[PDB]
Amino acid sequence: IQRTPKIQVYSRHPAENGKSNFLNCYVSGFHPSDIEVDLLKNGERIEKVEHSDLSFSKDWSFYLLYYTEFTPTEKDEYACRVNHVTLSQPKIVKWDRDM
Amino acid sequence: SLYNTVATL
Amino acid sequence: GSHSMRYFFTSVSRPGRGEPRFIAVGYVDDTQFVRFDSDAASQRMEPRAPWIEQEGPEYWDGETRKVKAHSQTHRVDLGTLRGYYNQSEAGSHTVQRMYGCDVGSDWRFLRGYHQYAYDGKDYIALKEDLRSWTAADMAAQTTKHKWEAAHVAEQLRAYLEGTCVEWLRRYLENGKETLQRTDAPKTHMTHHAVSDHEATLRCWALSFYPAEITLTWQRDGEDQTQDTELVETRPAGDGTFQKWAAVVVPSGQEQRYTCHVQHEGLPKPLTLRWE
Fold it and tell me: Is A85 on the interface with C (CB under 8 A)?
């Protein structure tokens, strides 16, 4: 069976311009495990991105946390780009400080 | 600590 | 305060070339403490929590040897399952396995588990009594007949009720500074006007551990689910978790709404109300 990923983009700590933080993209509920996840900065892919080790929930669907150290500003825009077999085209979720 | 013997399907 | 130890294993076949991708992770409650990735350079079980580094060479050599044996079993399984389901050798498939034990509040064995999935669906699982098997279909039925004749349940029961519990207790003591500590959620509420007559109240629960938690909204003392939204609990990345629940309310009526937070780290549930 196949299952589409749920996506959440958020920072580890309250967003504060000029204050060092971590940008997270949490993908869960998907199957199979092969997935492509990129964090973007003003539309461009961030290279220094790491992710947690593959794990899964009670229902067998997978979850992964991709994260990168970043410093939010008023102008810079951040987002998570996700591509999976279940998706016709790469999905993009913009980071919202209040969520 | 992991289990010792793993039986195959 | 009950606790658990669990191991998760995922194997993905790669028909194009080579062996399956194998990834294993070990957890105590919601804390990962080990991992093995067939794609990594060490080819060894590796630590992922400070308190497991205390273990000596014999520990890591034994765990590494055993986890490699697990990958080979999964490699074999992927082939066996391909046949059972009469599938092409060209497509990629997935076998997952999860097993472990819980200790109750009395620190004694409470329950054990050992389940298996193929392509994301239950395949075969050890029942709660740890003596019988649940087979999802006829492929799993053949496996069940084979495991009954080889008395696989008896061997697992011994591990789950003994070894598993013994090591879980050992890990709990060694990492007690974090494993036996609850981190109460840090909570606050934000207010966002969505229109001249409506506003959104978002109730935040941050940096808590374990992950289990409940956030509920009430209006004039009674639960409200309509016009609300609660996101799935997510990892902060530093070992703790986050969650929030929001409700849209008529501007000026914010005071009628209260957010209720229940978490093991709280002597009593917290109640938040907007300024």
Answer: no
